[PDB]
């Protein structure tokens, strides 16, 4: 056989494995702030705006909801550029394996 292909297939599998994870990181931060989309248009801070935490809520103004959400967004955006470091890293070593397979 060849020893390259099974290792050649490892980087390819970890490409989209790691690459897709940024999507659900976006979509959450995307949908997590839909909670902000809804709140300032309708239902301003004259009432209470609860920020869901698990099964329970923290009721506060228009502002703190767009804050405590932002930190749920903030922690999620950091792994985006932290993961894309490893995402964009796994594709080139694949191309590095693309070099030495043509000989064997």
């Amino acid at each position: 056989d060849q020893q390259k292909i099974n290792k050649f297939a490892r980087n390819t599998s970890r490409i989209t494995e790691l690459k897709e994870e940024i999507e659900v990181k976006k979509k959450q931060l995307q949908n997590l702030e839909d909670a902000c989309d809804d709140i300032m248009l309708a239902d301003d801070d004259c009432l209470m705006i609860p920020y869901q935490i698990g099964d329970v809520f923290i009721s506060h103004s228009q502002e703190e909801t767009q804050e405590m959400l932002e930190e749920a967004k903030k922690n999620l955006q950091e792994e985006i550029d932290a993961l894309e470091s490893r995402v964009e890293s796994i594709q080139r070593v694949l191309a590095d394996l693309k070099v030495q397979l043509y000989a064997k």
Partner: protein, 132 residues
């Protein structure tokens, strides 16, 4: 002889199927337990009562009911495996902060071994289809 590869073929079939399950079980657990740290920490007022704030009871799948949360100061934490323990304000934090570290570590080693495992599986998988 046909006897050499099929031993690897059957074992690499059982272990690759087993490890990827716990590799995925350790995968989903890393954010989940951590989110429960923060959910707890949102709810925790430290050196005080946790979760004195608003709540909506979860009765079942299709239903919520509004209420007021504050209990005696404890938090029940879902272990799985047909077991749950009571946990206090810190005792919830004690287990919960702890499982974030454990579930995070055991993946990559289980992954990296699975990496060479399926490198052993598929490499053996090529030579077996040759003869039989």
């Amino acid at each position: 002889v046909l006897k050499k590869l099929d031993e690897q073929y059957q074992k690499y079939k059982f272990m690759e199927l087993n490890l990827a399950q716990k590799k995925r079980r350790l995968k989903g657990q890393i954010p989940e337990i951590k989110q429960t740290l923060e959910i707890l920490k949102y709810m925790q007022k430290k050196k005080e009562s946790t979760n004195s704030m608003e709540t909506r009871f979860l009765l079942a799948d299709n239903l919520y009911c509004k209420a007021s949360v504050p209990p005696t100061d404890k938090m029940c934490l879902w272990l799985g495996a047909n077991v749950m323990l009571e946990y206090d304000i810190d005792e919830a934090q004690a287990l919960l902060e702890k499982n974030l570290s454990t579930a995070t570590k055991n993946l990559d080693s289980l992954e990296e071994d699975l990496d060479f495992l399926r490198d052993q599986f598929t490499t053996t998988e090529v030579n077996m289809a040759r003869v039989y």
